[PDB]
Write an enzyme that holds these catalytic residues in place. Structure first.
Site, PDB file in Angstrom:
ATOM      1  N   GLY A 136      42.517  44.354  44.364  1.00  0.00           N
ATOM      2  CA  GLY A 136      41.696  44.182  43.188  1.00  0.00           C
ATOM      3  C   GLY A 136      42.237  43.371  42.010  1.00  0.00           C
ATOM      4  N   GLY A 185      42.731  40.320  41.679  1.00  0.00           N
ATOM      5  CA  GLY A 185      42.108  39.007  41.594  1.00  0.00           C
ATOM      6  C   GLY A 185      42.704  37.924  42.470  1.00  0.00           C
ATOM      7  CE  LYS A 186      45.992  40.266  47.068  1.00  0.00           C
ATOM      8  NZ  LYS A 186      45.279  41.222  46.192  1.00  0.00           N
ATOM      9  CB  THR A 187      40.047  36.881  47.077  1.00  0.00           C
ATOM     10  OG1 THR A 187      40.788  37.669  48.008  1.00  0.00           O
ATOM     11  CG2 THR A 187      39.078  36.035  47.865  1.00  0.00           C
ATOM     12  CB  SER A 188      38.936  35.986  41.842  1.00  0.00           C
ATOM     13  OG  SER A 188      37.984  37.014  42.094  1.00  0.00           O
ATOM     14  CG  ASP A 238      41.391  40.121  51.207  1.00  0.00           C
ATOM     15  OD1 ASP A 238      40.753  39.786  50.172  1.00  0.00           O
ATOM     16  OD2 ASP A 238      42.640  40.261  51.240  1.00  0.00           O
ATOM     17  CB  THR A 296      39.634  45.110  46.446  1.00  0.00           C
ATOM     18  OG1 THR A 296      39.172  43.758  46.476  1.00  0.00           O
ATOM     19  CG2 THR A 296      40.801  45.276  47.422  1.00  0.00           C
TER      20      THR A 296
HETATM   21  N1  LIG Z   1      39.533  37.736  35.170  1.00  0.00           N
HETATM   22  C1  LIG Z   1      38.538  38.430  35.829  1.00  0.00           C
HETATM   23  N2  LIG Z   1      37.514  38.852  35.040  1.00  0.00           N
HETATM   24  C2  LIG Z   1      36.453  39.488  35.542  1.00  0.00           C
HETATM   25  N3  LIG Z   1      36.392  39.712  36.881  1.00  0.00           N
HETATM   26  C3  LIG Z   1      37.417  39.340  37.686  1.00  0.00           C
HETATM   27  C4  LIG Z   1      38.544  38.720  37.266  1.00  0.00           C
HETATM   28  N4  LIG Z   1      39.328  38.568  38.403  1.00  0.00           N
HETATM   29  C5  LIG Z   1      38.686  39.057  39.389  1.00  0.00           C
HETATM   30  N5  LIG Z   1      37.547  39.598  39.017  1.00  0.00           N
HETATM   31  C6  LIG Z   1      36.418  40.245  39.813  1.00  0.00           C
HETATM   32  O1  LIG Z   1      37.108  41.339  40.424  1.00  0.00           O
HETATM   33  C7  LIG Z   1      36.972  41.838  41.816  1.00  0.00           C
HETATM   34  C8  LIG Z   1      38.421  41.969  42.154  1.00  0.00           C
HETATM   35  O2  LIG Z   1      38.814  41.023  43.167  1.00  0.00           O
HETATM   36  P1  LIG Z   1      39.477  39.861  44.033  1.00  0.00           P
HETATM   37  O3  LIG Z   1      39.534  38.846  43.040  1.00  0.00           O
HETATM   38  O4  LIG Z   1      38.684  39.940  45.283  1.00  0.00           O
HETATM   39  O5  LIG Z   1      40.987  40.484  44.053  1.00  0.00           O
HETATM   40  P2  LIG Z   1      41.908  40.863  45.285  1.00  0.00           P
HETATM   41  O6  LIG Z   1      41.804  39.684  46.269  1.00  0.00           O
HETATM   42  O7  LIG Z   1      43.278  40.856  44.539  1.00  0.00           O
HETATM   43  O8  LIG Z   1      41.426  42.159  45.777  1.00  0.00           O
HETATM   44  C9  LIG Z   1      35.819  40.971  42.261  1.00  0.00           C
HETATM   45  O9  LIG Z   1      34.612  41.795  42.277  1.00  0.00           O
HETATM   46  C10 LIG Z   1      35.888  39.794  41.192  1.00  0.00           C
HETATM   47  O10 LIG Z   1      34.892  38.741  41.355  1.00  0.00           O
HETATM   48 MG   LIG Z   2      41.324  39.810  48.263  1.00  0.00          MG
END
Ligand SMILES: Nc1ncnc2c1ncn2[C@@H]1O[C@H](COP(=O)(O)OP(=O)(O)O)[C@@H](O)[C@H]1O
Ligand SMILES: [Mg+2]
Ligand SMILES: Nc1ncnc2c1ncn2[C@@H]1O[C@H](COP(=O)(O)OP(=O)(O)O)[C@@H](O)[C@H]1O
Ligand SMILES: [Cl-]
Ligand SMILES: [Cl-]
Ligand SMILES: [Cl-]
Ligand SMILES: [Mg+2]
Ligand SMILES: [Sb+3]
Ligand SMILES: [Sb+3]
Ligand SMILES: [Sb+3]
Length: 548
Positions: A18, A20-23, A45, A464
């Site tokens: 959670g 934000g790795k993927t994002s 993932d 996540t």
């Molecule tokens: N800076 C941010 N602000 C708001 N939402 C974010 C941010 N970074 C990630 N997210 C949102 O958070 C969730 C967390 O995920 P993801 O980015 O999939 O992280 P991970 O790959 O580390 O699990 C998603 O629903 C996403 O689109």
């Molecule tokens: Mg991920």
């Protein structure tokens, strides 16, 4: 962003579920493709959701991404890789060795450790395929291997070593038998990871004291192995502007700020960038790209309600489970305080040294000293007859995340006996996979009994985090243990705030809180984000909410 500058061919993002790795990976990939770069984004993932963010299907085949010329994608299913890693080892002996024996070997290839090794076998192929760098300028991964997995693969004993077929079975070395490639390719992959000219590692974190410490430790483990090209990216940071006119938002902004200035020593020397918390979970390219910018009520009972029902039989074992940092120690403390305050006998146990502190006795055990006892034990027991290289392999096996989870559970077992006369609240527990493994040789039936024991799963109102909790639950269910309830911690939709951005995040939680209520849990509790840290009884009493 510093992390976005002069990137080598391989870019890895690491950090807890959670963060934000993927994002960050997707957004990076877009940025690169738009600078005319040929990019390969590798989704790693378990329930890959990357196709969704690009509105298209992706698979185990490299496919170009329509909406982003220059960018192609590849999905490497870790569950599937593990399943196949497992099949290659077990199929040969199906119908050869007896069912209970095969079934036992299969269970040894069913833990997180096996998944991790399987993933590495996949990374290895990518990191060794030279031609790929003939087609791409950059290959981006949304997860990274751990120090433990890498050390395991760099140990000479991993090749020349037969450890008395894990009898008591405290072992996760079973996976090694499945290494598809030649010792040399893994060695190469490791050099590629250690070569700063080839690999860049991005440590993703949040401006929260706890996480920051976990990332610090991750940083030291990896540098010690040779990955010294590291960048820290603090994500989700609350923009100051928002601290205007709001107790909560101003208070959060305040706590992050402190932490931003008091970053753990080991991370202070690393190139650090910060990404601002966005109002909507990014769903498309516009949204993803906004992330790299340099400038800015659900009907669920309170935790009190869950304690209410737990109180019903005057005694029992309450076990809090969930990924790291979701709030198990905090929930465990709150639950113990409420019971106590209502006249019950409670014995709270913890593996973390921190608690203010009457019919509430607290036992804190030291993870480090218990781990070392357990390690000592398994060494005199399985380590005899092993040469030096074999002993180091075994010692590294005893450095698996589950080693500590087993040893702490071991210790907790002294007091788990009191759940018959009073309440015993535990803030951590082994996986279902580990329990089954331990049981092969431990109060299994006790844990399985719905009465004597109620397991609570702690999670966050995030995508996540919920998926990881569901997986933790599925595994427990295989061990014959059904979580009695789920606690959704750090919720904003149950907190008091007029911050427009915070209200917007709180709305983003709605779908997640919904899937927990109808698809994952029978009994669910909501806990608000308290701002500041719930260090003392007062605060700890506020998380619960009230009665009736
Ligand atoms: N800076 C941010 N602000 C708001 N939402 C974010 C941010 N970074 C990630 N997210 C949102 O958070 C969730 C967390 O995920 P993801 O980015 O999939 O992280 P991970 O790959 O580390 O699990 C998603 O629903 C996403 O689109
Ligand atoms: Mg991920
Ligand atoms: N609802 C909450 N509001 C504010 N901070 C919280 C909340 N729950 C947990 N935290 C804070 O988060 C960290 C998360 O941790 P912790 O409960 O130690 O859990 P775990 O045992 O799950 O690793 C600590 O810094 C903690 O005090
Ligand atoms: Cl495991
Ligand atoms: Cl395993
Ligand atoms: Cl492993
Ligand atoms: Mg804890
Ligand atoms: Sb393990
Ligand atoms: Sb295992
Ligand atoms: Sb391991």
């Amino acid at each position: 962003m510093q992390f976005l500058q002069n990137i080598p061919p391989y870019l890895f993002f690491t950090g807890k579920g959670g963060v934000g790795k993927t994002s960050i990976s997707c957004a990076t990939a877009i940025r690169l493709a738009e600078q005319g770069k040929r990019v390969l984004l590798v989704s790693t993932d378990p329930a890959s959701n990357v196709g969704q963010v690009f509105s298209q299907t992706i698979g185990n085949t490299i496919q170009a991404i329509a909406s982003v010329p220059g960018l192609s994608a590849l999905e490497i299913d870790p569950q599937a890789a593990a399943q196949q890693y497992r099949a290659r080892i077990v199929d040969p002996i199906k119908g050869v060795l007896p069912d209970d024996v095969v079934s036992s070997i299969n269970e040894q290839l069913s833990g997180a450790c096996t998944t991790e090794i399987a993933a590495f076998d996949e990374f290895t192929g990518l990191l060794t395929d030279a031609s790929l760098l003939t087609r791409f300028d950059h290959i981006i991964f949304d997860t990274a291997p751990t120090g433990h997995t890498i050390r395991l693969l760099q140990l000479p004993g991993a090749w020349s070593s037969f450890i008395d077929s894990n009898p008591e079975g405290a072992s996760c070395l079973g996976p090694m038998a499945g290494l598809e490639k030649q010792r040399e390719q893994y060695a190469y992959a490791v050099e590629a990871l250690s070569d700063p000219k080839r690999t860049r590692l991005v440590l993703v974190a949040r401006l929260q004291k706890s996480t920051l410490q976990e990332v610090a430790r991750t940083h030291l483990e990896l540098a010690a192995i040779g990955l010294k090209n590291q960048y820290l990216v603090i994500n989700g940071v609350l923009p100051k502007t928002e601290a205007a006119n709001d107790t909560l938002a101003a208070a959060i902004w305040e706590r992050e700020q402190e932490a931003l200035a008091n970053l753990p020593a080991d991370l202070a020397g690393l190139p650090t960038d910060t990404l601002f918390l966005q109002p909507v979970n990014m769903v498309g390219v516009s949204a993803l790209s906004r992330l790299l910018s340099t400038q800015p009520r659900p009907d669920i009972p309170s935790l009190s309600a869950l304690v209410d029902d737990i109180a019903r039989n005057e005694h029992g074992l309450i076990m809090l489970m969930g990924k790291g940092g979701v709030g198990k120690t905090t929930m465990a403390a709150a639950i113990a305080v409420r019971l106590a305050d209502m006249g019950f006998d409670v014995h709270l146990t913890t593996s973390d040294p921190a608690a203010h502190l009457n019919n509430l006795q607290v036992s804190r055990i030291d993870p480090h000293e218990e781990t070392e006892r357990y390690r000592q034990h398994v060494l005199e027991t399985k380590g005899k007859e092993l040469d030096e290289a074999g002993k180091r392999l075994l010692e590294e096996d005893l450095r698996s995340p589950c080693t500590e989870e087993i040893a702490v559970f071991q210790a907790f077992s002294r007091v788990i006996r009191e759940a018959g006369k009073r309440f015993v609240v535990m803030d951590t527990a082994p996986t279902g996979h580990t329990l089954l493994l331990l049981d092969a040789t431990t109060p299994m039936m006790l844990l399985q009994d719905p009465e004597r024991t109620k397991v609570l799963l702690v999670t966050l109102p995030e995508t996540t985090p919920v998926l990881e909790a569901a997986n933790l639950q599925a595994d427990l269910e295989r061990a014959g243990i059904h979580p009695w309830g789920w606690i959704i911690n750090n919720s904003l939709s149950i907190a008091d705030t007029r911050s427009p951005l915070l209200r917007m995040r709180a709305q983003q939680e709605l779908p997640q809180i919904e899937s927990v209520k109808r698809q994952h849990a029978s009994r669910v509790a909501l806990v608000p984000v308290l701002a500041s840290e719930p260090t003392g009884i007062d605060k700890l009493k506020q998380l619960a909410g009230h009665h009736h």
